[PDB]
């Protein structure tokens, strides 16, 4: 009944603005604009945002505010047959924790690494470098940059691992950074939301300040406007290519994060009559806007690299960790006051992921507290038991070969697993429960029903938008590979028996409860499709 509520309304919004904005807004969206014809890419990205992303973002936020419970209890109360959807989502988020925080450490390692007059990653005459060290990025594989060799040879020591079977030594300089991450996560989430919803004031906001002072520093560099050209010069040739709508579709889904039980969790502590539809629209737009901004911060410095440093644009217009740990640092090492751009750049990368780890873990804590009161009372104890396990098994990721184990989790822990789980979320809510019954819920909350646009996006466009991604995610499938390393067969099977370790609980729990209640066969479905609110 009388469960907690955000001490302030901004605490909620920043917790959502923060969960949604992470490194993928920096090291993935600007690249897609660059690859897919500049401004023209905003067409499919907006269309996929407006019909796939915002519909699913609004939906889970509503369910969270309305049913007032974490992800397990809530799906168990909409369609009890499909209660397993909640169980699956908590697992998928549990898995992602085993590799997502390790990239926050990388950001702190380079932070504790930028306390120097001469940043270490700029020169090719260190002990870790090779005879094939260029000062900047190239397009020949055997000859890496002074910052690709700093990252892959001093920070990581990935060179001393023959593959996933060879983990080798624990880098305790990194294992210390991982503990600093889970310490920050513990003392932000342990005493509940009253404290959490305050830390997001720094972690959700600090990036906007660094983005601003790096935007000025980026746009005032010789050649910055040439980067913006590479970033946004429209080329509508690509809008006619199918493999572009999939990049839009896939960026839209994995950047807003609907269906992972976090907006559900966060909204469950809203007041019942909060204008969550306005909270969806506001929060969403702020995500996509934060990527558009970041893309100037990148391609300004990318053009300056291409004009005053002699590097092909193709060779620095990268995505993923390489762009923020190798390319962009190596551009900072040239500009004056480099030490300052580093320290704020890495402190930005760190605070960008902490927001998101909070919500991923808060979805877990909430979902179980609302179902296992044995742990709802015992909270401070519980999270210590979660993070310690995360840390302990996370020592595996602080090895010389750790990265191989991470790329693996990166592909299977929340891959097609979350796509198919969210597919049964759209179907459960729109079809089994009922769009009409859902709108009547929404009316009672904010006072009006969802427009027909929203209701058509919920029973038709959403499951097809998802299906659209999931099918093409299987069309262009390949076996798992990093550089010349090809992961063994048993690594992939290990990965599948991780993606399935969550989806299977959808039909398993649907099979368990179906065989746990008395009655006739149809008589069972009807009892396992009647919501908890209708039975009283």
């Amino acid at each position: 009944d009388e469960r907690e509520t955000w001490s302030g309304k901004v605490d909620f919004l920043l917790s959502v603005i923060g969960f949604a904005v992470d490194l993928a807004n920096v090291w993935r969206f600007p690249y897609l604009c660059y690859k897919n014809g500049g401004g023209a890419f905003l067409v499919p990205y907006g269309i996929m945002l407006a019909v796939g992303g915002i519909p699913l973002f609004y939906m889970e936020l509503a369910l969270g505010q309305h049913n007032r419970k974490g992800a397990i209890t809530c799906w168990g109360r909409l369609v009890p047959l499909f209660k397993g959807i909640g169980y699956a989502v908590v697992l998928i988020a549990f898995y992602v924790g085993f590799y997502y925080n390790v990239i926050i450490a990388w950001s702190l390692r380079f932070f504790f690494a930028s306390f120097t007059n001469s940043l270490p990653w700029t020169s090719c005459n260190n002990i870790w470098n090779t005879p094939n060290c260029r000062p900047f990025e190239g397009h020949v594989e055997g000859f890496q940059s002074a910052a690709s060799e700093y990252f892959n040879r001093y920070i990581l020591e990935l060179n001393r691992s023959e593959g996933i079977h060879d983990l080798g030594a624990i880098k305790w300089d990194m294992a210390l950074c991982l503990l600093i991450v889970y310490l920050i996560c513990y003392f932000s989430l342990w005493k509940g939301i009253s404290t959490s919803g305050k830390v997001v004031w720094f972690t959700a906001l600090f990036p906007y300040a660094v983005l601003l002072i790096l935007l000025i520093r980026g746009l005032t560099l010789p050649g910055s406007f040439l980067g913006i050209q590479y970033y946004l010069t429209p080329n509508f040739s690509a809008i006619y290519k199918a493999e572009v709508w999939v990049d839009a579709a896939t960026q839209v889904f994995f950047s807003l994060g609907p269906g992972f039980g976090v907006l559900l969790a966060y909204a469950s502590y809203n007041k019942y009559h909060n204008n969550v539809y306005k909270d969806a629209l506001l929060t969403s737009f702020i995500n996509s806007a934060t990527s558009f901004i970041a893309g100037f911060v990148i391609f300004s410095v990318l053009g300056y690299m291409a004009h005053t440093l002699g590097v092909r644009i193709e060779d620095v217009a990268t995505e993923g960790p390489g762009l923020v740990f190798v390319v962009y640092p190596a551009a900072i090492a040239t500009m004056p006051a480099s030490t300052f751009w580093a320290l704020i750049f890495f402190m930005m990368l760190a605070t960008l992921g902490l927001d998101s780890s909070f919500g991923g873990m808060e979805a877990i804590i909430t979902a179980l507290s609302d179902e296992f009161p044995k742990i709802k009372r015992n909270r401070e104890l519980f999270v210590a038991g979660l993070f310690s396990l995360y840390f302990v098994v996370g020592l595996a990721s602080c090895t010389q070969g750790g990265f191989y184990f991470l790329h693996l989790l990166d592909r299977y822990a929340a891959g097609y697993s979350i796509l198919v789980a969210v597919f049964f979320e759209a179907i459960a809510v729109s079809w089994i429960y009922g769009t009409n019954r859902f709108s009547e819920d929404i009316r009672d909350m904010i006072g009006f029903p969802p427009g027909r646009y929203w209701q058509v996006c919920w029973r038709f466009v959403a499951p097809i938008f998802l299906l659209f991604i999931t099918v093409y995610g299987l069309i262009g499938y390949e076996p798992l590979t990093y550089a010349d390393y090809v992961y063994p067969s048993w690594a992939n099977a290990l990965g599948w028996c991780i993606a399935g370790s969550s989806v299977v609980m959808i039909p398993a729990v649907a099979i368990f409860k179906l065989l746990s209640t008395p009655g006739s066969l149809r008589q069972r479905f009807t009892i396992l499709t009647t919501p908890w609110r209708d039975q009283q």
Partner: antibody, heavy 119, light 109 residues
């Protein structure tokens, strides 16, 4: 084209019980929540009970709660109001109003049916 | 119960003149939740103004709404004889739902 016509109702003795009816036509009744508003002979409007578009959310007034019951029939487009334990204070014309959007008020009102509660 | 009080209770007015009438809540009301109904003698009420200032369908442009918080006002730029009615404000923001006490508009002669 949308039209509400209320029905039933007349003279009851105190403690009696009556059931009023509102016949919706000209729109998709099931998509809109409805509410009973009454008007005393002193010409004072008073809200009585709201019923959500699917009847799962139902708000009464403190002056009729425990005595009055509101219900829907989206199959035949009828809105009912079962009154028990009637009192002379319940004497009014009873109106049937259509209000699905709280930010828009009651967009369509019926025509009234009269209840006298006298011995 | 959010008691709404309308003032004046009765005002007479010559056609062409400008008339203002006030609605006063005992508890603040969000401006998107305060509406106005007209009721003519022997007939049912009609929705006239919703969300403080938005005119309902068929309402001539000589009517306006203003106000916010606990004080709101209906205003008729130049009155006509077909406006002689009783005006009720309504609050839709909390339960129980409450109607004002009425303003009666009569024609001066």
């Amino acid at each position: 084209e949308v039209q509400l016509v209320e029905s039933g109702g007349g003279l009851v003795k105190p403690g009696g019980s009556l059931k009023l009816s509102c016949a919706a036509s000209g729109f998709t009744f099931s998509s809109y929540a409805m509410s009973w508003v009454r008007q005393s002979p002193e010409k004072r409007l008073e809200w009585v009970a709201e019923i959500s578009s699917g009847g799962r959310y139902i708000y009464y007034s403190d002056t009729v709660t425990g005595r009055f019951t509101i219900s829907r029939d989206n199959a035949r487009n009828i809105l009912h109001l079962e009154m028990s334990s009637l009192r002379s204070e319940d004497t009014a014309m009873y109106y049937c109003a259509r209000g699905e959007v709280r930010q828009r008020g009651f967009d369509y009102w019926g025509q009234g049916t009269t209840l006298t509660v006298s011995s | 119960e959010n008691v709404l009080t309308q003032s004046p209770a009765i005002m007479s007015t010559s056609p062409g003149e400008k008339v203002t009438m006030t609605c006063r809540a005992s508890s603040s009301v969000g401006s998107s939740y305060l509406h106005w109904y007209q009721q003519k003698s022997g007939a049912s009420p009609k929705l006239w103004i919703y969300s403080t200032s938005n005119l309902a369908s068929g309402v001539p442009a000589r009517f306006s709404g203003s106000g916010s918080g606990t004080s709101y006002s209906l205003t008729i730029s130049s009155v006509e004889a077909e406006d002689a009615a009783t005006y009720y404000c309504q609050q839709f923001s909390g339960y129980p739902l409450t109607f004002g006490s009425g303003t009666k508009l009569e024609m001066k002669r």
